[PDB]
Amino acid sequence: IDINDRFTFSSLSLNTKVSVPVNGNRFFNKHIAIVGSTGSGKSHTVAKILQKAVDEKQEGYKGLNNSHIIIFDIHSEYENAFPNSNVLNVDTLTLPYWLLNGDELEELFLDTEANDHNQRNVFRQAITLNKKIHFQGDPATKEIISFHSPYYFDINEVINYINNRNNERKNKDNEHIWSDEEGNFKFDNENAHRLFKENVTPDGSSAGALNGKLLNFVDRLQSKIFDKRLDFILGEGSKSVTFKETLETLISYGKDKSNITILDVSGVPFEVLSICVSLISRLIFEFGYHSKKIKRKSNENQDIPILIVYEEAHKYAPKSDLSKYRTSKEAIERIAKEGRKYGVTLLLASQRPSEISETIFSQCNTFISMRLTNPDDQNYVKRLLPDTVGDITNLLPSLKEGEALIMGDSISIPSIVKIEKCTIPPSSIDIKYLDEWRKEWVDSEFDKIIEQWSKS
Amino acid sequence: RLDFILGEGSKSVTFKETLETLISYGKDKSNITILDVSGVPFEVLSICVSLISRLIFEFGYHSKKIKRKSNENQDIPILIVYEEAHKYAPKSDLSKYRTSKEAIERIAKEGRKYGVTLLLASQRPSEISETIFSQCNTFISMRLTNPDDQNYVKRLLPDTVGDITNLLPSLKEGEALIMGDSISIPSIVKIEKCTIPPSSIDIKYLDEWRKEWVDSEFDKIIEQWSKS
Amino acid sequence: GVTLLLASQRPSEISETIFSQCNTFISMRLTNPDDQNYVKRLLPDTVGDITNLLPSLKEGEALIMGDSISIPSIVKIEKCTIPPSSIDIKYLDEWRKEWVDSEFDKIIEQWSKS
Amino acid sequence: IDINDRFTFSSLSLNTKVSVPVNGNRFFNKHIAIVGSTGSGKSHTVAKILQKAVDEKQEGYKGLNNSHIIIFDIHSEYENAFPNSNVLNVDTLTLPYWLLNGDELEELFLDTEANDHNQRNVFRQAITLNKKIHFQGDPATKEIISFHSPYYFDINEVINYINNRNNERKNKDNEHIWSDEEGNFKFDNENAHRLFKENVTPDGSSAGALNGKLLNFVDRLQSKIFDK
Amino acid sequence: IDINDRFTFSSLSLNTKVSVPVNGNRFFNKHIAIVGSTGSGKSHTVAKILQKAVDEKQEGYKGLNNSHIIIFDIHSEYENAFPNSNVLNVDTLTLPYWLLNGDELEELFLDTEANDHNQRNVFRQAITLNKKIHFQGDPATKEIISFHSPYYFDINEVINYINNRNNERKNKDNEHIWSDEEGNFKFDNENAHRLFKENVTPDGSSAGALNGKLLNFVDRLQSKIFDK
Amino acid sequence: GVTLLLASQRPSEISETIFSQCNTFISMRLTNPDDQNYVKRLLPDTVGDITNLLPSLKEGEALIMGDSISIPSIVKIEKCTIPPSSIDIKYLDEWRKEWVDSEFDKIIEQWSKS
DNA sequence: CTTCTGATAAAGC
Ligand SMILES: Nc1ncnc2c1ncn2[C@@H]1O[C@H](COP(=O)(O)OP(=O)(O)OP(O)(O)=S)[C@@H](O)[C@H]1O
Ligand SMILES: Nc1ncnc2c1ncn2[C@@H]1O[C@H](COP(=O)(O)OP(=O)(O)OP(O)(O)=S)[C@@H](O)[C@H]1O
Ligand SMILES: Nc1ncnc2c1ncn2[C@@H]1O[C@H](COP(=O)(O)OP(=O)(O)O)[C@@H](O)[C@H]1O
Ligand SMILES: [Mg+2]
Ligand SMILES: [Mg+2]
Ligand SMILES: [Mg+2]
């Protein structure tokens, strides 16, 4: 490895005095998968890698460098490990509902499929038209606004529009005639924006095309917006935030600049967690994709690289083919296959290699295998290795806390290494189980645990 | 069948009374809490296994968050003993086992840091889901005659000490092999005899069969059978 | 008179029907085990110790068989004097330099137009 | 390999001085598969073979040879390897929509589950009729023209037909009367083509069968065409 | 092998003077499998076996013998080996579509991708009816005419019936009424045979059972038929 | 009286229930190990060191077993005086030629007329 | 004439 290409975070297990470095360029553009049994030290190994990546500064300046790391925290550990970082829990993070790219907007609001037609187009027509109403730029790019375009629309006018078309009344000439405080108006393309207001009364001889057909649809729509689970995305805080401040929040480019961004998704439900993982994975990927094509036309190199750390990837990217894992898997898989070119790579952390999907986990060209006692997990590590050097996998069950085997394109030979101790460790200390059992029967405060459990 | 969860008693009791009942923190305080689910059907056994495991894990999770606010570690650790784990957490990917498997898997995957760990008992290593046994650092093995099970124990060991699995079929009663970070070297041990043992002693077939034809009182058995 | 040249970093996801129609195969370093299993089964020829040979191929090293070459050979393909545009983001080298200012408005304006 | 059939683009790995040729006729006349991992050298290998392919000329002439290679460059990366070659970007490239067959036309315009079956049929009927009207060959092959057959058709005229069918006014005898500047005509197979004009007015005492149904379908089609 | 049974097409590899005969009867009434790699020589082996089997005669006559060999030549290579033989390419060969069975007719026309049952029933019903019309034999085997039976049917009439069933009309009496030059009839199995003509015009009140769901089925059938 | 001759370059893709109905097997140079292992199981007889024999067969060299032959023998099939020749496009011969102009205009008018 | 009810149907899964 070239001397100016060396990135070390560990030393050899057999000889402590020799440090084992990896090709620092090749370590991060080719995806990292770290696996090992429970309590093996994956979180400390991940934190030690990102700590050395933060302090990896070229000579000639003072201040924080160009590292960009996003950590998905489901156990709230790396707040302590990175004190000068930005932590974004669900109660304080705002991800707007107008940043959905259409496919997830289709899935977020509609729990139905295979039969909704009249409920479908009135949903997409309301959103697409409301984006042109609230658009404040030149009209040349107003016409190119579509359902998947990331422009602000009011969801409360969208519900008002669908609840109005619920109450349609046509006239003997077969067109819907409305009436508002300015006067009666035909329901047409240039007059469809007036249905966004609640105070419209229809005048008609007969019921309209969608009269009484969206009463079930509006109730499902209203009883999803006021979910406090989705208050980070569908709440009132997404109203006053814009596209720009969303990106400064995700990669810590705001008033507090940090190389590490941590998202506290610790005790949230899965449906909140699956929305959080799939949104930010797509948003970071498309930011890296679009910043790449800006740099293509400029023919310049001021690109920023982003690494996303996916701890507990079995929660949101498992091998199982369930539909509740579908939207989260596809966002991470897109980063796994195509994300390497645009500057968005992933750090995959899980406790078995055989539970993460093969379309995601086999795209990782570097590997940090800690202790694995499962015969199916060891066979995965053996088959990633040629049979000449496959005998080093025999030491996997004998690995105690701190050692792992690093293989991949970024390292010369696969070696059992000792990951360097974290002087600023994450908050994942092993509980001294017997020493906490020799004490008194301590009176656990049940009231304090319950009234947080209740709000959680 | 669901009277324990959907009965009239669910109205009266509170959240704090339930948590105190499950870990014996009530008026009668005990180190050991036993859930006697002996004759219940699977559909209410899987409900009991999955809900109590979820409640205890989230109690351990929320206790740690309270302790982390005061810059403290978790005060009370909880160990859950899953006896006869093949009934609710098997290798099979059937949909009936899904809720009970996922609750125990959450404890196995994530309960180490939250103070909720598990002791899992079953006949064979191969009849339990691999997700739970892979996370078990300590692995105690009694006599194992099935060759698939013996090779499963063999791969858990390093190859230098892997020859100790050859005494697995000849293991006597109370003779165990203890592995993991707890023990210095994997070794065959003799578990200390229980002065107060579980009431699961083998019944002497020849001693019982040598006596007279017993009347068996079918009315009392059927009366109990019909209640269950 | 219309023939194919199929280049793919994951040969396993290519359909077996179209991949079988190929007659000359250039096999570079194949680290993915499913890519190894797929290629070795569908290769028209074999070489000695091919299981360890495919991961061990160096950069620009190839294994060529087919009916256009008599002996399956390990070949060091000559370097491109005029190389194609290579996308190799040096994450360490870009992370060592100072925190660069991001033109978010330029990126977002192209993102919103898409 | 014969002396005139040799195509050398590589050299032996163990012996650098030895160059390994392939049968150049046999190499390209049968399909080639270049597989490898990421960064193995596939794109440089593809560039090297094609660079040597265009340099294979007979000594008699100067200028371009008869090699014709088309690259589906998904990463916009082969322009540097072949600077003199023609490159077709999205602004540069021009594919006519009418050369798409029936399945490709449907996937371009129509949507999964977002289109009713009657909305789909008027789309298919308009295109398969517009292909016949803009056909300028002999009329013997007009009857064999279908929706799948690729012939030139005006997609804006297709919009006008669909927009007119959205404004249809049915008569008392379940047919549609249409008024044009030439005159009034009942819609049938013989005069369906006069709906491709924009300036056609419907005459009827009642709303047509497809009236008010394709208005949603018009705006989705116009959104597709005017999308830049 | 008896000398009259001998059939020699090869000689021993190690001794060229030893010609290896096979039992020429037994070689051919039991199936032959010639396997090899590409470029091993199995096309030449097939050609040499058949040239040896064509020029073998009783020598009591002058002329062609009784060999009957059919080659499914997919590479167009055996024309050179047998110049005096009959070669049938796409331009020369005519294969009747009505000798196809039901599975082959489904594979030629239907697609398993869409797998629409409603296209499948009308397709089988049209052909099975049309095979009964064009059948000139005795009535006692007309009732066993099926979709799978190898009898002549008109594919343009089948398309015409299928296109007509896309134009069905539903009346207040829930019968389908059609108008023809011969007369006016109801959609009965006796009267369905006059839907095979294109010159019919439907009469009714509302849309029929199969209205609007066969146009994509007609266009794909018409795409196959008018494909050159 | 309707028998069949199977000539395949990938024997391991043939279904086992059809390939086992054949009695006489003319096994030429088999080179893929999957086709070698498939054929060796369903062959009615065996020969000495058939594993190394099959990829080592020379050009026209074959191996015939079955009811027809007495013993499995390595044979040289007789050379075809009138060989089966396929009209194949010589790419490097055509690509070495000058760039052709007259032919492209003739192809388009043929495509348009039919 | 329009409204409402009820029945038939088709769905996707
Ligand atoms: N290099 C190391 N040297 C010594 N102890 C270490 C080292 N790395 C980690 N540890 C210890 O490992 C313990 C548990 O490690 P963790 O990283 O929390 O386990 P884990 O990998 O997160 O497994 P799960 O599935 O998340 S519980 C910590 O309390 C550390 O003290
Ligand atoms: N014949 C060769 N000799 C030496 N180095 C080579 C050779 N071929 C490729 N390389 C090196 O390989 C690097 C990247 O190779 P590429 O061909 O661009 O990657 P690839 O094989 O196409 O994989 P992807 O998935 O397309 S990034 C180049 O920058 C060269 O340094
Ligand atoms: N019995 C034989 N003796 C000598 N040469 C042969 C023999 N059989 C085939 N060949 C040569 O082998 C080449 C392979 O041709 P072919 O039989 O078409 O291959 P394949 O087995 O792939 O069909 C031919 O060019 C021919 O000259
Ligand atoms: Mg962890
Ligand atoms: Mg490339
Ligand atoms: Mg051949």
Author numbering:
A (entry chain B): 116 to 571
B (entry chain C): 344 to 571
C (entry chain A), F (entry chain F): 458 to 571
D (entry chain A), E (entry chain F): 116 to 343
Please give sentences taken from the publication describing this entry:
Here, we biochemically and structurally characterize a two-component defense system DUF4297–HerA, demonstrating that DUF4297–HerA confers resistance against phage infection by cooperatively cleaving dsDNA and hydrolyzing ATP. DUF4297 encodes a protein containing an N-terminal DUF4297 domain (a putative PD-(D/E)xK-family nuclease) with predicted yet-to-be biochemically characterized nuclease activity and a C-terminal domain (CTD) with unknown function. HerA, widely distributed in archaea and bacteria, encodes a DNA motor protein, which can hydrolyze ATP and translocate along DNA. The enzymatic activities and anti-phage defense function of the DUF4297–HerA system are activated through supramolecular assembly.
We incubated a 59-bp synthetic duplex DNA (dsDNA) and ATP analogs (AMPPNP or ATPγS) with purified DUF4297–HerA complex and determined three high-resolution cryo-EM structures. Particles in the sample with ATPγS generated a consensus reconstruction essentially identical to state 1. For state 1, subunit F and DNA-engaged subunit E bind the ADP molecule, whereas three other DNA-engaged subunits B–D bind the ATP molecule (AMPPNP or ATPγS in the structures). Interestingly, subunit A, which is located at the lowest position of the spiral staircase, can bind either ATP (ATPγS in the structure) or ADP molecule, suggesting that this site may be the nucleotide exchange or ATP loading position. The presence of ADP in the ATP-binding pocket can be explained by the low AMPPNP and ATPγS hydrolysis activity of the complex. Specifically, in the dataset of the sample with ATPγS and DNA, non-alignment 3D classification revealed two distinct classes with almost equal particle populations, with three densities adopting more-or-less C3 symmetry. Superimposition of these two classes showed that the linkers connecting the N-terminal DUF4297 domain and the CTD display different conformations. Further particle symmetry expansion and focused local refinement yielded two maps with an overall resolution of ~4.2 Å. The two maps align well, indicating that the DUF4297 domains in these two classes adopt a similar conformation. Two AlphaFold2-predicted DUF4297 domains fit nicely into the density, revealing dimerization of the N-terminal DUF4297 domain of the upper layer DUF4297 proteins.
